[PDB]
Design an enzyme around this catalytic site. Sequence first.
Site, PDB file in Angstrom:
ATOM      1  N   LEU A  77      74.792  43.458  36.795  1.00 13.25           N
ATOM      2  CA  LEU A  77      75.574  44.478  37.325  1.00 13.25           C
ATOM      3  C   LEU A  77      74.833  46.021  37.054  1.00 13.25           C
ATOM      4  O   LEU A  77      74.154  46.044  36.285  1.00 13.25           O
ATOM      5  CB  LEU A  77      77.006  44.493  36.563  1.00 13.25           C
ATOM      6  CG  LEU A  77      77.798  43.297  36.964  1.00 13.25           C
ATOM      7  CD1 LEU A  77      79.096  43.572  35.941  1.00 13.25           C
ATOM      8  CD2 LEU A  77      78.209  43.158  38.532  1.00 13.25           C
ATOM      9  N   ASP A  78      75.379  46.761  37.926  1.00 13.15           N
ATOM     10  CA  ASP A  78      74.804  48.370  37.722  1.00 13.15           C
ATOM     11  C   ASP A  78      75.575  48.891  36.632  1.00 13.15           C
ATOM     12  O   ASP A  78      76.654  48.308  36.311  1.00 13.15           O
ATOM     13  CB  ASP A  78      74.913  48.968  39.028  1.00 13.15           C
ATOM     14  CG  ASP A  78      74.053  50.337  38.969  1.00 13.15           C
ATOM     15  OD1 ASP A  78      72.694  50.149  39.126  1.00 13.15           O
ATOM     16  OD2 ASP A  78      74.728  51.248  38.864  1.00 13.15           O
ATOM     17  N   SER A  79      75.128  50.217  36.179  1.00 14.34           N
ATOM     18  CA  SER A  79      76.054  50.781  35.097  1.00 14.34           C
ATOM     19  C   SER A  79      77.348  51.394  35.921  1.00 14.34           C
ATOM     20  O   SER A  79      78.455  51.253  35.258  1.00 14.34           O
ATOM     21  CB  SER A  79      75.297  52.124  34.886  1.00 14.34           C
ATOM     22  OG  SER A  79      74.185  51.684  33.990  1.00 14.34           O
TER      23      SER A  79
END
Lengths: 185, 82, 52, 43, 115, 156, 114, 318, 176
Positions: B38-40
């Site tokens: 996942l991205d931030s």
Amino acid sequence: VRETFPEATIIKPADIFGREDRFLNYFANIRWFGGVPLISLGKKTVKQPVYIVDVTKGIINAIKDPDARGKTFAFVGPNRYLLFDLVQYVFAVAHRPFLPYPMPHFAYRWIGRLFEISPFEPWTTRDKVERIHTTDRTLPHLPGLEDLGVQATPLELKAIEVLRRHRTYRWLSSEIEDVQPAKTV
Amino acid sequence: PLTLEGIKDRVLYVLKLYDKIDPEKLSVNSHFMKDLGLDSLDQVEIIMAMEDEFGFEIPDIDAEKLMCPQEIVDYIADKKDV
Amino acid sequence: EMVRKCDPHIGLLHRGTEKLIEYKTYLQALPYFDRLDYVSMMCNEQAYSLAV
Amino acid sequence: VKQDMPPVGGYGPIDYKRNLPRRGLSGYSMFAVGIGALLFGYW
Amino acid sequence: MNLMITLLTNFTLATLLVTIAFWLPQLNVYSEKTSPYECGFDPMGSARLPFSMKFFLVAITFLLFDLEIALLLPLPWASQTTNLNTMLTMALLLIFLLAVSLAYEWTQKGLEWTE
Amino acid sequence: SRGEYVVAKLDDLINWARRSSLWPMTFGLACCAVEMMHMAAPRYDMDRFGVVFRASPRQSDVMIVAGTLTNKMAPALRKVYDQMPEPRYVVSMGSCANGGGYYHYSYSVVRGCDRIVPVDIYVPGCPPTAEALLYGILQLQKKIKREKRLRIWYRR
Amino acid sequence: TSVKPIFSRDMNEAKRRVRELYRAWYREVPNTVHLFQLDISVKQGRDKVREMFKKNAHVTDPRVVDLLVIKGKMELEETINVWKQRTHVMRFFHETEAPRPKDFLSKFYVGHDP
Amino acid sequence: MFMINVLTLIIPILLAVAFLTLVERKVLGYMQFRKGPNVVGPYGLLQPIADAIKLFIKEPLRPATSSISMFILAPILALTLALTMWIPLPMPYPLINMNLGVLFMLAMSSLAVYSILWSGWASNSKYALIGALRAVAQTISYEVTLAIILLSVLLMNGSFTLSTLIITQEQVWLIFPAWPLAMMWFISTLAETNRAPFDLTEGESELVSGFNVEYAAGPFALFFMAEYANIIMMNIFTTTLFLGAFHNPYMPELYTINFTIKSLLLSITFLWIRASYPRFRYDQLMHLLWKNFLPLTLALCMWHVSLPILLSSIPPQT
Amino acid sequence: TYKYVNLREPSMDMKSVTDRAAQTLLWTELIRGLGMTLSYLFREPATINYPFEKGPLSPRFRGEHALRRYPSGEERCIACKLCEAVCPAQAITIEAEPRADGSRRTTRYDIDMTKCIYCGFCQEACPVDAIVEGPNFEFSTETHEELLYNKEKLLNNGDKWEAEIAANIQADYLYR
Ligand SMILES: CCCCCCCCCCCCCCCCCC(=O)OC[C@H](COP(=O)([O-])OCC[N+](C)(C)C)OC(=O)CCCCCCCCCCCCCCCCC
Ligand SMILES: CCCCCCCCCCCCCCCCCC(=O)OC[C@H](COP(=O)(O)OCCN)OC(=O)CCCCCCCCCCCCCCCCC
Ligand SMILES: C=C(C)[C@H]1Cc2c(ccc3c2O[C@@H]2COc4cc(OC)c(OC)cc4[C@@H]2C3=O)O1
Ligand code: SF4
Ligand code: SF4
Ligand code: SF4
């Protein structure tokens, strides 16, 4: 036209809906007459409407492509609908009181002659009745929007765009996700 | 909000409502960035979904120090009684 | 109807006069000054004339 | 030469002042007219 | 009888100058021509917000001074009575009570507006 | 025919009633607002023609776009035009409203108000004189006079 | 190379302000879809805010992302208050452009653009 | 023949209003150094026909946020209360000869606010609601003297009949015993009828049009010829109250001509006050009818109560 | 060298105080305003009967453009492009070539009338008085491309209005 211009591109749209149509605005203008009467409850006819931006992209991609000489396209929507839950979906997006009732096959053309006595643009006629109660045929042997590089837009994205006009103030700004999707067949 | 069982189940339910988290690898000790992939921004909308459901605001310093659902349920256990 | 805060958003008639001045000569830069204060035309003509 | 010039003796003097000419009656005369109107109407 | 015929005729050709005005032109309505007016740009929020009244003490006291002309009004008939000095005294008493009310609203910052 | 004669007389009647009572709306933008005011001045006087201002878009027949249409007031002009009831007309006044004019190549000017609204009369000038603006309104009247509404209605 | 900062000393406070700005947009987007009565959903608007934040996601300079936080907060300030209109919000959604062909052969076909 | 009696009343005060629009435009033209409309017909005598036919074929435009039942009920009620306030006026004989016709006029002056009021509420806009509550702020100002001045002027008449008021003024005009009440009543009627300096709900400067900024043509014509019907009715009402003319019972046409020309001069006085004056801030409307007109109105009410008892000039109630 | 607007301390004797009280109660300045308005009621208003009358102008007036000619038929525009180098709107597009008799003449003289600012730098920068800005101001249109004047429309304006433009330049060329 096919026997007098053999390279004519003949295009079949099913039932186009837009902001200035005669399909969804028609289905939203029978809160004036009564309780939107339907032939045989409007359950024996199946439709798939197509949005006008997709049909216009198909016509222009038919102009650009020289693979359209003499063809016979068939522009259809990606999802099929019955008529009854289509009208109920229109009256749920428009957020209106929906109470349907069946008007019979022989007495609804007598209401169809009641509106075509006008020298104006008539409100409805028995021809519009016979066209709404004509189900959309499926023509698999003919090309469509996916054979022109056009991705078809479904009804639940653009019916709000068509039908935000026909709302009262008490649900004037209800969101797109605040309605139940209709039942495809 | 009462016991850690219901809090952990509610964490895992809000996580599996998110249509990018796979419910197969989603465990209590799975990692968001390098293991869930996942991205931030995904992690920050996870934290805001938890702020919506649990109903209390987490500041920015202690919304980045939550790298697994065990850390989310532990920090909610720190911000509550249980 | 009492007034608590006035915030005038301007720039609805912003046309970029003083960027078009940079690309035209001085004699060509004069008729912008007719159109800045368009009820004080020859005043702004006089001000730009005194500047040049 | 033949140029746009003012005439040799100049122009006439141009008034530029406030001239509000002070017309109308006095205050006591207007109240006298008003009270006389009331008394005639009442009679 | 005839008053009701007059009022009904007035309402009749005050709504028959309306029903000949709606169905007569060609209605070409689309979903921008019936939008609310806020001088060009889009309106901020709704128009049904609380729209605060600063002139509210005057708007209350208008009722109490309009009851006065439910009291003061029979005086062109009360001048026809044979108990005359009491009529004169009570009439000037009601206008004096209205004047005391008006001066009390004057001096105690009533007829001024708030904020 | 006879019904054609009736609808021809009614076309003359309603086009006369629409051209002899044009209501422009108070919509100035730039220097052409001054000359539009001078077209409403005592000397040239639009109102002798039956031509009077009404400030609301709901109660106006024509919108004289007097001045520059920038990139920040394109949606205000479009919504102001769209809130006008049919029939509505547009007299594009001055060079910036016609084709961008003197600020044509600039970053924040809509290059002609015909991009935003349909334009029925183009009045050229910078500013066009109030006499020439009055000539533009009279050419708008000559455009309304040769409308063929009920003739085309009967012949469809 | 010793310059004056704007708000952040290094990338920690810079990522903090970027993260709080995206928090603000994620809180705000349903109000934007509601009061501008757009035909889009909240999901497509949040996809667009994700695309606008990943468009500039390669910056390593703290002053540049400080000014990007400043410009994003000005966009937020003009979106929360109704100072933008329906057109100003929908200018992010490039609906009216013809879709630009990306591959080489179509760019060869339609013009001289590299 | 009472139906034809009503239709010879109400249609000519739809034509007097129409050509009053031409009189207003041309008098306001020549008082402003221009000309009025004179291109349409011969010197403008076909202008109001053009303004009438043009509006009723323009698109009606029901707003998408408006409360449409109230939005259609308000102009019908406007033109209804424009028409129904002509019936107790003696011309020299009224159409409906009430015992209490003055209270009928005053109560329908109170009721005719609700057309403007519901039109400003129901047309769901911001400017319309500002214009509605400024009509509230206007009516709570003029109704606190429009009743007491009308009361004090009927202490010398005798009753609340307008037919009695011609018998009252047979010797002298009633403007001579009551010129402060006349000059205060006149401004009460200017604030009553939304003419300048008391526009304030048709205020093109503060608002765009006030209450009827949403009313497109069709129903906007029925505020045009409702408001000007109110001004002609109110000039005739002040004419009957203060300038009642010589009445001969065998020749009613002399009196009809005489109060016609007097009410025409007062209508030109309305259009000539509209042609010269700036417009009040809408608290100075309220700080006039409450701080300046109301105390002196109470004082003159005390004087006109105590004066027929002081002079034995009590009028008859018969 | 300066004066104080609104620094009039009013008189406070019983005479002027009674005068101002009667001015307040009996509305003196309102009758002054009514008198001034009624005095402009009884004049001849300055409304001129357009289009049967016309507004006053001067021979310097700057309206619809035109290309002039010598009094032998040959056109004046010798294709020297000063009028596009000075045109502040850049509303003029000129392309030239040597024609059959070898004289330097244009083949494209476009004036975009919806770019043009009507300031007359072209008619004063032209060294042969070829481009002139004529007296026609009643040249309004109904379509946008009708106001994109090429060489043919400007020669037609010149030949159409030469009887007026030549007289205006004949009356004005001593001031320039
Ligand atoms: C009906 C027939 C026609 C009637 C007359 C028609 C022509 C006149 C109309 C002219 C145009 C008016 C247009 C609108 C003007 C609006 C402004 C306005 O009216 O302002 C009001 C102004 C307001 O004044 P103001 O606001 O300037 O007050 C000053 C206030 N300070 C100091 C705080 C700033 O005047 C009045 O209110 C006057 C009220 C009526 C006066 C009546 C006086 C009676 C006198 C009796 C005798 C007194 C002597 C002593 C006692 C003796 C006893 C026997
Ligand atoms: C209480 C008093 C109230 C009074 C209210 C009314 C006041 C004003 C009255 C009218 C004043 C004159 C109006 C004249 C209008 C123009 C008439 C005319 O001749 O129009 C010519 C036009 C074209 O005809 P054409 O064959 O081309 O002839 C031109 C010659 N080369 O042909 C046409 O346009 C066709 C014919 C149109 C005729 C219109 C006539 C005027 C209608 C006005 C309504 C009121 C009627 C009169 C009421 C009072 C008397 C009862
Ligand atoms: C009503 C009549 C007779 C006149 C007055 C008037 C118009 C038409 C348009 C406008 C107008 O006045 C208002 C206020 O004054 C300016 C002054 C302006 O510039 C000095 C300006 O520039 C855009 C715009 C305006 C308004 C505007 O649009 O006709
Ligand atoms: S066309 Fe020119 S002179 Fe006219 S308003 Fe525009 S900038 Fe001003
Ligand atoms: S008058 Fe027009 S064509 Fe001539 S220089 Fe000026 S802008 Fe250019
Ligand atoms: S019009 Fe005059 S300045 Fe322009 S190119 Fe021709 S001769 Fe030269």
